[PDB]
Design a protein around this motif. Structure first.
Motif, PDB file in Angstrom:
ATOM      1  N   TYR B  28       0.820  -0.825   0.272  1.00  0.00           N
ATOM      2  CA  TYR B  28      -0.078   0.305   0.237  1.00  0.00           C
ATOM      3  C   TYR B  28       0.677   1.340   0.180  1.00  0.00           C
ATOM      4  O   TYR B  28       1.779   1.484   0.439  1.00  0.00           O
ATOM      5  CB  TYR B  28      -0.905  -0.099   0.960  1.00  0.00           C
ATOM      6  CG  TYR B  28      -2.010  -1.197   1.616  1.00  0.00           C
ATOM      7  CD1 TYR B  28      -2.839  -1.117   0.700  1.00  0.00           C
ATOM      8  CD2 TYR B  28      -1.984  -2.486   1.730  1.00  0.00           C
ATOM      9  CE1 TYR B  28      -4.024  -1.815   0.255  1.00  0.00           C
ATOM     10  CE2 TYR B  28      -2.759  -3.249   2.236  1.00  0.00           C
ATOM     11  CZ  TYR B  28      -3.687  -2.438   1.251  1.00  0.00           C
ATOM     12  OH  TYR B  28      -4.603  -4.086   1.334  1.00  0.00           O
ATOM     13  N   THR B  41      -9.325   4.005  -0.927  1.00  0.00           N
ATOM     14  CA  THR B  41     -10.155   2.763  -0.623  1.00  0.00           C
ATOM     15  C   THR B  41      -9.199   1.675  -0.753  1.00  0.00           C
ATOM     16  O   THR B  41      -8.296   1.644  -1.596  1.00  0.00           O
ATOM     17  CB  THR B  41     -11.289   2.833  -1.480  1.00  0.00           C
ATOM     18  OG1 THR B  41     -12.189   4.220  -1.189  1.00  0.00           O
ATOM     19  CG2 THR B  41     -11.790   1.528  -1.328  1.00  0.00           C
ATOM     20  N   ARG B  42      -9.192   0.207   0.448  1.00  0.00           N
ATOM     21  CA  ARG B  42      -8.209  -0.583  -0.505  1.00  0.00           C
ATOM     22  C   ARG B  42      -9.410  -1.540  -0.389  1.00  0.00           C
ATOM     23  O   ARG B  42      -9.651  -2.397   0.703  1.00  0.00           O
ATOM     24  CB  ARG B  42      -7.297  -0.835   1.308  1.00  0.00           C
ATOM     25  CG  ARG B  42      -6.217   0.313   1.321  1.00  0.00           C
ATOM     26  CD  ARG B  42      -5.261  -0.083   2.721  1.00  0.00           C
ATOM     27  NE  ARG B  42      -4.351   1.660   2.753  1.00  0.00           N
ATOM     28  CZ  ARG B  42      -3.604   0.948   4.089  1.00  0.00           C
ATOM     29  NH1 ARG B  42      -3.704  -0.090   4.352  1.00  0.00           N
ATOM     30  NH2 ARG B  42      -2.708   1.813   3.045  1.00  0.00           N
ATOM     31  N   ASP B  44     -11.206  -5.068  -0.448  1.00  0.00           N
ATOM     32  CA  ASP B  44     -11.090  -6.584  -0.601  1.00  0.00           C
ATOM     33  C   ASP B  44     -12.180  -7.500  -0.121  1.00  0.00           C
ATOM     34  O   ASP B  44     -12.416  -7.605   1.117  1.00  0.00           O
ATOM     35  CB  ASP B  44      -9.577  -7.059   0.018  1.00  0.00           C
ATOM     36  CG  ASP B  44      -9.248  -8.458  -0.665  1.00  0.00           C
ATOM     37  OD1 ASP B  44      -9.463  -9.671  -1.707  1.00  0.00           O
ATOM     38  OD2 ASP B  44      -9.262  -9.307   0.692  1.00  0.00           O
ATOM     39  N   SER B  91      -2.076  -0.305  -7.575  1.00  0.00           N
ATOM     40  CA  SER B  91      -2.634  -2.042  -7.470  1.00  0.00           C
ATOM     41  C   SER B  91      -1.702  -2.411  -8.019  1.00  0.00           C
ATOM     42  O   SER B  91      -0.117  -2.291  -8.470  1.00  0.00           O
ATOM     43  CB  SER B  91      -3.521  -2.453  -7.717  1.00  0.00           C
ATOM     44  OG  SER B  91      -3.861  -3.792  -8.314  1.00  0.00           O
ATOM     45  N   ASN B 224      -2.775  -5.505  -3.290  1.00  0.00           N
ATOM     46  CA  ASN B 224      -2.917  -3.572  -2.330  1.00  0.00           C
ATOM     47  C   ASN B 224      -3.377  -3.055  -3.167  1.00  0.00           C
ATOM     48  O   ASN B 224      -2.732  -2.295  -3.913  1.00  0.00           O
ATOM     49  CB  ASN B 224      -1.829  -4.490  -2.467  1.00  0.00           C
ATOM     50  CG  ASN B 224      -1.210  -5.356  -0.804  1.00  0.00           C
ATOM     51  OD1 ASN B 224      -1.937  -5.557  -0.450  1.00  0.00           O
ATOM     52  ND2 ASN B 224       0.463  -5.033  -0.932  1.00  0.00           N
ATOM     53  N   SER B 225      -5.180  -3.100  -4.049  1.00  0.00           N
ATOM     54  CA  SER B 225      -5.509  -2.330  -4.782  1.00  0.00           C
ATOM     55  C   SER B 225      -5.972  -1.001  -3.821  1.00  0.00           C
ATOM     56  O   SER B 225      -5.870  -0.641  -2.387  1.00  0.00           O
ATOM     57  CB  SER B 225      -6.415  -2.793  -5.354  1.00  0.00           C
ATOM     58  OG  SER B 225      -6.463  -3.778  -6.091  1.00  0.00           O
ATOM     59  N   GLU B 226      -5.952   0.327  -4.585  1.00  0.00           N
ATOM     60  CA  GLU B 226      -6.275   1.590  -3.672  1.00  0.00           C
ATOM     61  C   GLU B 226      -6.698   2.492  -5.244  1.00  0.00           C
ATOM     62  O   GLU B 226      -6.546   2.397  -5.956  1.00  0.00           O
ATOM     63  CB  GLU B 226      -4.637   2.650  -2.801  1.00  0.00           C
ATOM     64  CG  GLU B 226      -4.540   1.780  -2.452  1.00  0.00           C
ATOM     65  CD  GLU B 226      -3.359   2.352  -1.399  1.00  0.00           C
ATOM     66  OE1 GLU B 226      -2.392   3.029  -2.362  1.00  0.00           O
ATOM     67  OE2 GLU B 226      -3.404   2.054  -0.218  1.00  0.00           O
TER      68      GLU B 226
END
Lengths: 131, 231, 223, 231, 223
Positions: B28, B41-42, B44, B91, B224-226
């Protein structure tokens, strides 16, 4: 199935189920299939993309010979048809791959069962027997 | 082994052998000025999961394929939804490439990850259209694999995170790619961060009676998307 | 029906037990008694058989072995059904005993055959029969040669007559109701998918075989 | 592994995977009234051992086979001798079914044990002869496998102790069957306790040049036998 | 019959006891009552006797001495059998008491003779009679001269009539059922192999004597 025949003796059921696919090919045949479940209230998926956007399994029968798919919950309350279904489909992820001098055709066998969460109520008599 | 992430489960073998791209894991973002104002926003839940493309058919005459990310996922699932809007994006990915082939098939595939992979014009100045920069979920096929269509030798493609698939030994490959950019966040719509490439270096060979086409299946797991402010 | 919703809760588990599944007294036979003097017999015998009707027959063939006590109830009426005070006799004949040869025959006075005398205006009579088999269970599947007479696992027989010196002209039918009690079951079987051709044997028509599931247009379309 | 019982030794692999029928092991009888008077015979010297039948040839057109026990052993060795006379009989069994097939053969066999398995008439009242009730060492073949020739769906045959043989994964199966009866002792001559069934559910398939017939070998080991007064 | 197998286990021991062997109420006599005014008597008397029927007679002659209480049940019907509300009187007459000489005779009003009044539409009446003998047991074998009237060991007598002022034209038969209770037995005898010639005495035909076992071809061949 037996679940199928026992349910005919009861008016209401509910619980979870299990569906097993078993591939009988040659040892050296290989490929993938997409085993997907569309819940009740929706038509069966139109293509593989929309089947992949929901509960599913990618099953490579070159590696694994048998796969199970648990259906989370099903119910029939109960001549309007009160059960809104939900569907299992089978897709070709790949094409069935075959080496030289082996048949190139196989069969899948399907099985079904109830998980321990399944229950039944309001006894009755089966529509199969006529007398 | 069976890998289960969300509502998707794939069959694959368990091997500690993977390729970390450049040797770092997805992370992140280190806290920034803009995202201190609005916490990013994270997700999952259903967002980060296995996506599996339409499999590609490798035949004796092939050239090979490439994909662009985030683009390949721009119309999919709930990731493409978040990919839409959300003018800030970050990501990593987990990429697993598979091949279903009998022991009687022979050949090999070079599989690589190229950051900022730019297809050029084959001409004048024929600026390549949105088809080469954004081929979509299907992907594109190479014209001149030997130059990669960048004007660059494929021999030297091995300074990129890569794995061979030799139908003799291994049928699969897995590459962990972190987020790689000169700026922490960027636009997922107008900028593709990197691209994925599968080129047969040794052509597919078989004797008559074997299947003439071998499928290659891609699987993409975001890591680890944002996502940013909503367009 | 009605009431269409989703049931999020587990049902009651008590209704699925073997002992509840074979309970609920029901009709095991109908026999008819005309007392006509010498032109008509004037009595009835009914051998105890579970398989006479296929509803309950199908539920006993789910298992290989069973053990239970039976409870019988006799509902008896006259033609149009209006009842008059006539005494009746239900005699039970144990396995391995001679049955009545006629209305006044000496077997009706045998004491080892237990009897019950009740007027036709009274509430129906009830009787409890124990587990009668020389084995530890009844089995309707026996691979071998039983021979020896009629159904398998002989429980007994009931005989009914009217108690009078002179034949009373009266036309009776006695509905028999049986309720299984304390039922144990072993070695479950598959449920029959074919029509029954005849009693005592699991025959099936070879030329016409019915298929367990009904048919649809194509395999690639559910609805 | 090599299993050696008495003067017979078979080659088979060692796997803890077996099927106990109904979950109980063969046992000697709980003491009874008759056998307290005359102590029953519990032979194991040459009596309890591996018997191996004539192997069966599974071809593309087959239907499948069944056997009746104790009957199949009534004329064999020193068991059939004790099976003769001895008006009281009790025993369990160990059943191993084998299939010799190349990796290029495909198909599957359902293998089950049915207590009190009764073949019926296919007609009237054609009471099936001693051939269907007592086929002997060779066994019999099914007419209508789909109904099992009992008037019963083969789909539901799986509430019986059973194992699949899928020529893909496993070539063998082993089922331990205890003594199952409504009475402790019975007559081995006029009553068969259970029966064994091997039905190809998926037919045998191969490409030309392969062997057209695949052998199925049966092996029977009695367990905890008991015999009564001598006829 | 059916169910042919071998029984390896001991049976229940309770059915062979003397007290169970003489239980099970059964028919000890039939008497017929026509109330015809003066052309017919209009009542019945039945002396209490066990030996009247040879089935139970043979089972009491297995022993020398017995002791027990009796329980009687009267099943009474009219000709064709349809019942109407008529009162009846079963009077018991103890040993050593005068019996009714007629329908309206004064003996019916004696209080020491215990009575029961029940309508013919009611369920059958039951009565319990104690051990009545001046000895410690009844004996149907007495070597000597008893003389003194009719069967041995007089238990009593029952008399039945209809209770009305005017004779109701009605034709009755009363079946009497007796159940022995608390039975003790002493000094067992051999079971009779010969036909009975007459009651109260163990006479047998000397010219024709039946042999205890039936006959076969030769002694050296079983079957």
């Amino acid at each position: 199935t037996l679940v199928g025949q026992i349910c005919r003796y009861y008016t209401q059921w509910s619980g979870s189920l299990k569906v097993t696919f078993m591939f009988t090919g040659s040892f050296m045949a290989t490929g993938k299939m997409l085993v997907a479940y569309s819940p009740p209230g929706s038509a069966q998926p139109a293509n593989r993309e929309t089947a992949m956007l929901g509960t599913h399994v990618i099953w490579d029968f070159g590696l694994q010979s048998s796969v199970s798919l648990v259906i989370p919950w099903i119910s029939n309350t109960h001549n309007y048809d009160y059960y809104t279904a939900g569907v299992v489909t089978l897709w070709y992820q790949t094409n069935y791959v075959v080496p030289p001098e082996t048949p190139g055709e196989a069969y899948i066998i399907a099985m079904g069962a109830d998980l321990y969460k399944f229950t039944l109520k309001i006894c009755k008599d089966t529509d199969e027997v006529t007398q | 082994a069976q890998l289960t992430v969300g509502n998707s489960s794939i069959t694959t073998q368990e091997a500690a052998n993977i390729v970390l791209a450049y040797g770092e894991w997805p992370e992140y973002c280190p806290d920034t000025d803009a995202t201190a104002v609005d916490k990013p926003t994270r997700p999952d839940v259903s967002v980060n999961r296995f996506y599996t493309l339409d499999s590609k058919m490798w035949q004796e005459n092939s050239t090979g394929w490439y994909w662009k990310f985030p683009d390949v996922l721009n119309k999919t699932g709930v990731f493409g939804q978040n990919a839409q809007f959300h003018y800030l994006y970050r990501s990593g990915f987990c990429l697993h490439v598979q091949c279903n082939a009998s022991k009687f098939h022979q050949g090999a595939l070079l599989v690589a990850v190229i950051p900022e992979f730019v297809i050029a014009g084959r001409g004048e100045a024929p600026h390549p259209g949105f088809t080469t920069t954004f081929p979509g979920t299907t992907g594109a096929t190479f014209h001149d694999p030997y130059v990669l269509d960048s004007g660059v030798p494929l021999s030297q493609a091995l300074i990129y995170p890569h794995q061979w698939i030799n139908l003799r030994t291994n049928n699969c490959a897995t590459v962990i790619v972190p987020y790689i950019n000169a700026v922490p966040f960027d636009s997922a719509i107008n900028h593709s961060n990197f691209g994925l490439i599968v080129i047969p270096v040794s052509p597919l060979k078989y004797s008559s009676g074997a299947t003439t086409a071998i499928p290659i299946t891609i699987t993409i797991a975001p890591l680890n998307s944002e996502f940013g402010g909503l367009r | 029906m009605i009431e269409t919703r989703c049931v999020v809760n587990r049902n009651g588990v008590l209704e699925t037990t073997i002992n509840h599944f074979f309970s609920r007294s029901g009709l095991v036979g109908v026999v008819n008694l005309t007392d006509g003097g010498t032109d008509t017999t004037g009595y009835v015998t009914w051998d105890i058989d579970i398989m006479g009707f296929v509803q309950l027959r199908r539920k006993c063939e789910m298992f290989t072995y069973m053990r239970f006590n039976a409870e019988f109830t006799f509902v008896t009426t006259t033609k149009n059904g209006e009842a008059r005070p006539y005494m009746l006799q239900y005699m039970y004949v144990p396995p391995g005993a001679p049955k009545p040869t006629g209305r006044d025959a000496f077997q009706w006075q045998t004491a080892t055959n237990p009897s019950v005398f009740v007027k036709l205006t009274d509430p129906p009579a009830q009787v409890s029969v124990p587990f009668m088999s020389p084995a530890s269970a009844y089995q309707w599947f026996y691979d071998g040669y039983p021979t020896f007479g009629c159904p398998n696992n002989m429980m007994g027989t009931f005989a009914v007559r009217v108690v009078s010196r002179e034949a009373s002209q009266l036309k009776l039918q006695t509905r028999v109701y049986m309720k299984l009690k304390h039922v144990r079951a072993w070695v479950p079987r598959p449920i029959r998918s074919q029509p029954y051709l005849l009693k005592n044997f699991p025959n099936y028509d070879s030329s016409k075989i019915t298929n367990s599931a009904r048919d649809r247009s194509s395999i690639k379309q559910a609805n």
